[PDB]
């Protein structure tokens, strides 16, 4: 599913992602735009054999299990395919544990390079919240 700008913002807020661990709602919406272009069915392969899945591109080396990553962990205890659904519940819950491992939202390379230090509130401008 291809989400709308204001549509995805409302969905993230309903799941308690807004200001989770100190990161405002505009930060998560900016990260989803450049990681996925608001597309829940996005997948991308990595160098070491791992793969990123979903609207936030969660990595299979530690967090989910796709059955093709030798010597990896499944710390979120979930199949990677669950992060591609039209419902964003599984991506949000695992993202909360990822952001709690000690490095914050710096685990997402796209956020650090394209959202960190910008006008992130403009991504929710005009929306009815």
Instruction: Give the tokens for residue 68.
Output: 């093709």
Q: What region does 84 belong to: left with phi over 0, alpha with psi -120 to 50, or beta?
A: alpha
| Nearest-angstrom CA–CA distance, 116 and 45 | 24
Which residues sit at the interface with Na ion, rule CB under 5 A?
60, 65, 69, 72, 74
Q: Is position 49 an interface residue for Br ion (rule: CB under 5 A)?
A: no
Say which entry of Na ion, Br ion, none residue 93 contacts (CB below 5 to 8 A, set by partner kind).
Answer: none
CA separation for the pair 5, 76 (Å, rounded): 28
Q: Which does 82 bind (CB under 5 to 8 A by kind): Na ion, Br ion, none?
A: none
Closer CB to Br ion, 26 or 54, in the complex: 26
Three-state secondary structure of 8-45: HHHHHHHCCCCCECCECHHHHHHHHHHHHCCECCCEEE
Q: Where are the beta strands (DSSP E) in the chain?
A: 43-45, 51-53, 58-59
Please check if 66 is assigned to a binding site: no
Please confirm, yes or no, whether 52 is among the known catalytic residues: yes
From the candidates 7, 18, 48, 52, give the one annotated as an active-site residue. 52
Q: In this chain, which of 7, 37, 44, 73 binds Br ion, going by CB under 5 A?
A: 73
Q: Is 24 in the site for Br ion (CB under 5 A)?
A: yes
Q: Does 26 bind Br ion (CB under 5 A)?
A: yes
Just list the catalytic residues.
35, 52
Contact residues toward Br ion (CB under 5 A) are 5, 11, 24, 26, 69, 73-74, 87-88, 104, 121
């Amino acid at each position: 599913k291809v989400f709308g700008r204001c549509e995805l913002a409302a969905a993230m807020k309903r799941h308690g992602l807004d200001n989770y661990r100190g990161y405002s709602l505009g930060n998560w919406v900016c990260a989803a735009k450049f990681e996925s272009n608001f597309n829940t069915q996005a997948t991308n392969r990595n160098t070491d054999g791992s793969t990123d899945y979903g609207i936030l591109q969660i990595n299979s080396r530690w967090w989910c299990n796709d059955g093709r990553t030798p010597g990896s962990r499944n710390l979120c205890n979930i199949p990677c395919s669950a992060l591609l659904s039209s419902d964003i519940t599984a991506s949000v819950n695992c993202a909360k544990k990822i952001v709690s491992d000690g490095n914050g939202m710096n685990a997402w390379v796209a956020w650090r390079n394209r959202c960190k230090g910008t006008d992130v509130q403009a991504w929710i401008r005009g929306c009815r919240l």
